[PDB]
């Protein structure tokens, strides 16, 4: 995401002070995180006996239970990967590049079929099927998830803004740009201590509005304008913002500047979800995790029993 780190106020928070909170988890961010940090001794991804990567399933299961043991009730938010994904103020132009000049012509030679295999992989190790498998696992676990209309980080931010959850869990700071009141990092990966970022604190301390923060983000470069503007960093961008000339500069330097802004200010969201937890299907989890994905039986058994009691007691 946007490298705000060194430039915005934030504070380390203990797992204890996070007890009893509801959180919306940025699903894809979490999955990618598990894939890069949950690996073998040699840095190789976790895999079952068929050679399929199980890194994500491991984090989904154990990380989610770890959170519930500390009275942190999570709701998983996914992007809803399938084709259509228009972020309801997001149809005018792109979402990929299928619109114009995306290189369209006649050609389908040896390299074309060698390229046949040369696509799906683009979807990194985190494949749609793996993502679908993670959702299935959550259902078996009785853990609720939402398939956002488009960007999951936007859906999670909206849920937090509404007060349905206390914060958005993610390793990225981008949720702040969608108005998320709070973001908590380092829960999906615990190398460092949990870190809380309160949007109100960021704005008051830096003396800027959310709209100003988004401008700084645009200067630095968002997923919507990679590379940002002329190598300008946070300091220089913040300088232009405080001077009151940032907006004029961005209109000149960034095509579709207004469109990008609308993505953060007017994302497509949904109210169709539930934070309710359900009892876990112990048998189905064992079959999926142990039988089909070679997880250690003993460990899984112990955890599904603990998960059941947590939800039973929570509920
Ligand atoms: Mn992002
Ligand atoms: Mn995302």
Swiss-Prot record:
Coiled coil: none annotated. The keyword Nuclease applies. It comes from Methanocaldococcus jannaschii (strain ATCC 43067 / DSM 2661 / JAL-1 / JCM 10045 / NBRC 100440) (Methanococcus jannaschii). Interacts with PCNA. PCNA stimulates the nuclease activity without altering cleavage specificity. Mg(2+) 2 binds at residues 172, 174, 223. Belongs to the XPG/RAD2 endonuclease family. FEN1 subfamily. One of its GO terms (biological process) is DNA repair. NCBIfam families: fen_arch. InterPro entries: 5-3_exonuclease_C_sf, Flap_endonuc, Flap_endonuc_arc, HhH2, PIN-like_dom_sf, XPG-I_dom, XPG/Rad2, XPG_DNA_repair_N. The gene is fen. It comes from the Archaea. Mg(2+) 1 binds at residues 26, 79, 151, 153. This is Flap endonuclease 1. Its EC number is 3.1.-.-. Residues 115-244 are annotated as: I-domain.
């Amino acid at each position: 995401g946007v490298q705000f780190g060194d430039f915005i106020p934030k504070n380390i928070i203990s797992f204890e002070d996070l007890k009893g909170k509801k959180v919306a988890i940025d699903g894809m961010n979490a999955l990618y995180q598990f894939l890069t940090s949950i690996r073998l001794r040699d840095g190789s991804p976790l895999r079952n006996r068929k050679g399929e990567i199980t890194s994500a399933y491991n984090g989904v299961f154990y990380k989610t239970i770890h959170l519930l043991e500390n009275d942190i009730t999570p709701i998983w938010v996914f992007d809803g990967e399938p084709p259509k994904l228009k972020e309801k103020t997001r149809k005018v132009r792109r979402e990929m590049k299928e619109k114009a000049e995306l290189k369209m012509k006649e050609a389908i030679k040896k390299e074309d079929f060698e390229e046949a295999a040369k696509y799906a992989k683009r979807v990194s190790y985190l494949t749609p099927k793996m993502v679908e498998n993670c959702k299935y696992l959550l259902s078996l676990m009785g853990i609720p998830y939402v398939e956002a209309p488009s960007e999951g980080e936007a859906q999670a931010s909206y849920m937090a803004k509404k007060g349905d959850v206390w914060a958005v869990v993610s390793q990225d700071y981008d949720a702040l740009l969608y108005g998320a009141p709070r973001v908590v990092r380092n829960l999906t990966t615990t190398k460092e201590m949990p870190e809380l970022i309160e949007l109100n604190e960021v704005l008051e301390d830096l003396r800027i509005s959310l709209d100003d923060l988004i401008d700084i983000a645009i200067f630095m470069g968002t997923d919507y304008n990679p590379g940002g503007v002329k190598g300008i960093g946070f300091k220089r961008a913040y300088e232009l913002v405080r001077s009151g000339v940032a907006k004029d500069v961005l209109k000149k330097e960034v095509e579709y500047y207004d469109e990008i802004k609308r993505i953060f200010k007017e994302p497509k969201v949904t109210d169709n979800y539930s934070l309710s937890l359900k009892l876990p299907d112990k048998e189905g989890i064992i079959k999926f995790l142990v039988d089909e994905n070679d997880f250690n039986y003993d460990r899984v058994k112990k955890h599904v029993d603990k998960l059941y009691n947590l939800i039973a007691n929570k509920t």
